[PDB]
Amino acid sequence: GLMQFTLPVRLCKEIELFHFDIGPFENMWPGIFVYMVHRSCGTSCFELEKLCRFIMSVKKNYRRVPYHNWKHAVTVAHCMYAILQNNHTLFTDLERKGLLIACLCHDLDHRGFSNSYLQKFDHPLAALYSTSTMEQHHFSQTVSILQLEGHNIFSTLSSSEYEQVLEIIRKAIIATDLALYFGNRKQLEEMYQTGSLNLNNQSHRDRVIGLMMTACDLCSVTKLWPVTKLTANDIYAEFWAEGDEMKKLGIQPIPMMDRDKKDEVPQGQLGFYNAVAIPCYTTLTQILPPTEPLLKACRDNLSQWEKVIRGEE
Ligand SMILES: Cc1c(C(F)F)nc2ccc(C#Cc3nc(-c4ccccc4)cn3C)nn12
Ligand SMILES: [Mg+2]
Ligand SMILES: [Zn+2]
């Protein structure tokens, strides 16, 4: 009841910053997530015994792949924690509750393959869910774990509060489909610049939470350079495995997934920062000013990739 979680001093202070790295000690990641729920949401949001059992089941349903793993789940939740703590009064009790869970769950049972590869392999999930294939699967796994005995962390919510929270989580998880990001950010850009953006309009909140989700999901481009650079190795380890699998089906993968074109990674990261990351954090900073550190760190990393291209590293 009066059982606070506390972190060592360097973590207690650094966890509040956007560029925090959760570290290589897997056994501390659950405690870090509980710490973030307790300060983000309150010590009363969830029954501790249920939350702990929920976390350990979520962890067991992430696979040992190079990037889309348990460490990515907790990393994406910590970015969400930083956004919520820097924008205290902008979010409902239900949103605080839903979004950290959404982030922890957002890639449940990922296999390290894109929606495209599922469609070309003709995976059963591609027939069950024709768009946002993996993302509809992640939400489906979340509901499964929520319905295991002793795992219902939302048990104290009313029938209609429960339905709202599962709807926040569903939209949040669907929005991590980067194919959906491009149109969502363009609409948020237009709405902000014409002054129609209205946080009382629920379909507007939906879009802002969607963009927050893309920003949390891409938060590896916002870390200190050595974290960003080493994470890129995990990201490409999956892309190149998918590339290998495309070649097995008799299909030339795109160059991003072709390990034969390793040499042009620096130029590919440039494209990605300019086409995806920079716009994402730009529009997010416009709508939520205290998120500017994400944009600043993103720009610093683009500048490090430029340096790699010029042979300065
Ligand atoms: C860092 C990161 C994160 C997360 F850290 F945010 N998520 C993502 C998602 C995509 C990418 C890319 C990428 C990319 N490489 C190439 C390329 C590479 C070699 C030869 C030719 C082309 C093209 N392209 C778009 N980076 N990324
Ligand atoms: Mg995903
Ligand atoms: Zn993700």
Curated annotation (Swiss-Prot):
Domain PDEase: 1-312
Gene behind the chain: PDE10A
Name of the protein in question: cAMP and cAMP-inhibited cGMP 3',5'-cyclic phosphodiesterase 10A
Keywords: Allosteric enzyme, cAMP, cAMP-binding, cGMP, cGMP-binding, Cytoplasm, Disease variant, Hydrolase, Metal-binding, Nucleotide-binding, Phosphoprotein, Repeat
Tissue-specific expression: Abundant in the putamen and caudate nucleus regions of brain and testis, moderately expressed in the thyroid gland, pituitary gland, thalamus and cerebellum.
Primary localization: cytoplasm
Disease (UniProt): Dyskinesia, limb and orofacial, infantile-onset: An autosomal recessive, early-onset hyperkinetic movement disorder characterized by axial hypotonia, dyskinesia of the limbs and trunk, orofacial dyskinesia, drooling, and dysarthria. The severity of the hyperkinesis is variable. Striatal degeneration, autosomal dominant 2: An autosomal dominant disorder characterized by striatal degeneration and dysfunction of basal ganglia, resulting in hyperkinesis.
Top-rank lineage group of the source organism: Eukaryota
Keyword set includes Zinc-finger: no
Source organism: Homo sapiens (Human)
Binding site residues for a divalent metal cation 2: 107
A GO-annotated cellular component: cytosol
Similarity annotation: Belongs to the cyclic nucleotide phosphodiesterase family.
Keyword Translocase set for record: no
Residue positions of the active site: 68
Residues engaged in binding 3',5'-cyclic AMP: 68, 269
Record localization: Cytoplasm, Cytosol
Effect of residue 107 to A: Loss of activity and of zinc binding
Residues binding 3',5'-cyclic GMP, per UniProt: 68, 269
Protein's GO biological process: cAMP catabolic process; cAMP-mediated signaling; cGMP catabolic process; negative regulation of cGMP-mediated signaling; regulation of adenylate cyclase-activating G protein-coupled receptor signaling pathway; regulation of cAMP/PKA signal transduction
